[PDB]
Amino acid sequence: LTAAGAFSSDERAAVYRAIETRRDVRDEFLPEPLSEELIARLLGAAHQAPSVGFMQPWNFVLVRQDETREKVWQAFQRANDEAAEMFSGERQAKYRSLKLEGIRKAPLSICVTCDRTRGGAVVLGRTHNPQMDLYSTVCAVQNLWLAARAEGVGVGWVSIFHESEIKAILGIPDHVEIVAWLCLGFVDRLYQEPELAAKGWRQRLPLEDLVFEEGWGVR
Amino acid sequence: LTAAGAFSSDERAAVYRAIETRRDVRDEFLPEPLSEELIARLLGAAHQAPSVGFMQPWNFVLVRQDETREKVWQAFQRANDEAAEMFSGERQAKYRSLKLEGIRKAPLSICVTCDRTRGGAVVLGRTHNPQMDLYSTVCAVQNLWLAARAEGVGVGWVSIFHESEIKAILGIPDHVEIVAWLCLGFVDRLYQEPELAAKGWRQRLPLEDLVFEEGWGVR
Ligand SMILES: Cc1cc2c(cc1C)N(C[C@H](O)[C@H](O)[C@H](O)COP(=O)(O)O)c1[nH]c(=O)[nH]c(=O)c1N2
Numbered sequence: 001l002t003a004a005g006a007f008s009s010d011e012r013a014a015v016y017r018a019i020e021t022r023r024d025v026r027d028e029f030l031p032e033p034l035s036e037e038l039i040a041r042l043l044g045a046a047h048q049a050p051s052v053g054f055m056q057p058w059n060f061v062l063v064r065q066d067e068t069r070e071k072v073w074q075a076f077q078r079a080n081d082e083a084a085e086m087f088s089g090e091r092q093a094k095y096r097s098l099k100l101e102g103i104r105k106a107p108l109s110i111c112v113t114c115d116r117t118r119g120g121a122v123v124l125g126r127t128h129n130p131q132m133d134l135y136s137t138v139c140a141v142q143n144l145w146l147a148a149r150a151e152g153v154g155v156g157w158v159s160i161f162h163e164s165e166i167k168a169i170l171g172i173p174d175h176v177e178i179v180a181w182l183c184l185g186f187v188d189r190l191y192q193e194p195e196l197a198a199k200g201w202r203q204r205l206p207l208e209d210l211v212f213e214e215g216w217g218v219r
Numbered sequence: 220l221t222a223a224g225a226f227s228s229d230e231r232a233a234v235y236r237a238i239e240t241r242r243d244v245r246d247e248f249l250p251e252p253l254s255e256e257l258i259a260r261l262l263g264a265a266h267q268a269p270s271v272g273f274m275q276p277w278n279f280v281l282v283r284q285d286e287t288r289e290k291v292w293q294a295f296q297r298a299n300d301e302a303a304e305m306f307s308g309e310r311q312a313k314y315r316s317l318k319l320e321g322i323r324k325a326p327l328s329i330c331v332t333c334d335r336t337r338g339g340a341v342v343l344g345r346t347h348n349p350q351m352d353l354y355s356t357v358c359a360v361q362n363l364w365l366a367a368r369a370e371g372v373g374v375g376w377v378s379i380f381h382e383s384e385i386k387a388i389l390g391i392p393d394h395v396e397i398v399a400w401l402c403l404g405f406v407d408r409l410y411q412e413p414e415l416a417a418k419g420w421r422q423r424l425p426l427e428d429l430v431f432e433e434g435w436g437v438r
């Protein structure tokens with residue numbers, strides 16, 4: 001141990017800045033590839049996330065080739081067609097008009113998975129609450145996302161697709177689970193608020209009535 | 220949109236410092252209570268996390284009272300011993316020596332929840348996994364975890380308990396689910412590396428072993 005620790009005003013501002021400015025990026029990806037050194041720093045961030053029992057259940061399968069990004073994209077559509085069919089009248093139109101991935105456009109894609117049996121037979125956290133290993137994995141992702149914003153790299157989480165297909169296309173064991181598919185690529189333009197809000201799909205909720213005092217539903 | 224690019228060297232360094240020094244703090248929480256202005260910032264960070272279909276499924280229940288922390292600490296006890304009994308040998312006595320919560324010590328606790336039904340009948344980005352909603356909530360948590368470090372606020376995740384027992388305490392309805400119970404409080408010091416690694420319970424896996432290329436198992 002050592003060092004108390006409030007950051008300086010400048011450091012504090014930067015952290016907040018990464019937090020207040022990252023976005024899910026679908027259509028503004030740049031073709032320029034990321035250096036091996038950059039990717040390492042982004043995965044290095046991810047790897048420094050907390051994880052239940054410190055089992056560090058994650059794996060990152062990097063995807064860089066056209067054949068693969070084509071099969072996955074095909075896997076997206078199909079899934080997205082089904083999704084669309086869940087909305088009627090007006091909404092559907094809107095849904096079917098949104099951009100929900102840039103699988104093809106983005107140079108690098110990362111498939112972050114969770115090994116449901118990493119470590120031993122028992123473990124902390126993951127005792128009566130199995131989800132924790134997965135939750136640990138999502139933290140990994142959030143970290144990547146922020147470090148990415150910092151690096152001027154765009155990131156997009158795509159979740160519209162049958163896991164089995166993606167697992168098959170990547171040859172992932174069934175004892176292993178996909179937490180997230182991430183599209184990555186530099187970006188020079190960013191929405192100043194959630195795109196999904198801008199395109200009028202859903203607004204930002206007022207935090208003030210999402211916060212309770214000492215007991216559920218108590219303001 | 221709006222023009223955008225990488226952070227400056229200085230800023231970039233700040234972001235990585237939060238990602239690099241935050242710890243699950245258990246036993247070194249300080250007594251002073253977080254000012255209201257501070258809390259709003261942390262909650263603001265979490266609220267600026269992404270969320271499938273921009274559904275924003277979270278709710279935060281602030282727990283500042285002793286009777287509440289007492290009860291929860293107890294729920295923790297029950298579950299933790301039960302957990303303990305899943306080990307044997309030095310490993311059990313080992314476990315039984317790890318401080319795995321600061322419920323009674325941290326001046327503030329936050330129960331981060333996930334409304335499983337918010338976002339209408341059928342939300343965007345979901346169906347090809349109904350847990351993306353929970354996942355989203357985690358991102359909120361991780362953002363809170365990171366901002367807090369910059370705020371010089373230690374945070375620890377406590378998952379060791381039977382959810383229903385915690386839901387009863389705070390009266391959390393059925394459609395909502397607990398994703399995390401976070402103990403917050405100012406710290407005066409941090410472990411330079413993960414504490415479980417310091418206590419020889421488990422080490423940092425070598426990141427190179429986890430990174431694959433194009434397909435599972437391929438290095
Ligand atoms: C777990 C999870 C999964 C997804 C998302 C998010 C999260 C948290 N998001 C991005 C989502 O739509 C986005 O967070 C909101 O629209 C607001 O984004 P930003 O505030 O700009 O990050 C998303 N976006 C998209 O275009 N296709 C997808 O399949 C998903 N899936």
Ligand SMILES: Cc1cc2c(cc1C)N(C[C@H](O)[C@H](O)[C@H](O)COP(=O)(O)O)c1[nH]c(=O)[nH]c(=O)c1N2
Pocket residue numbers: 048049050051052053054124125132133135136139241242243244245318319320375376377378379412413414415416
């Ligand atoms: C989803 C999830 C859930 C838990 C944790 C983490 C995560 C990601 N951790 C914290 C964990 O023990 C910690 O990550 C490791 O000790 C090392 O990571 P740090 O870098 O120190 O945070 C944790 N710690 C603890 O004392 N009791 C608990 O119930 C849990 N549960």
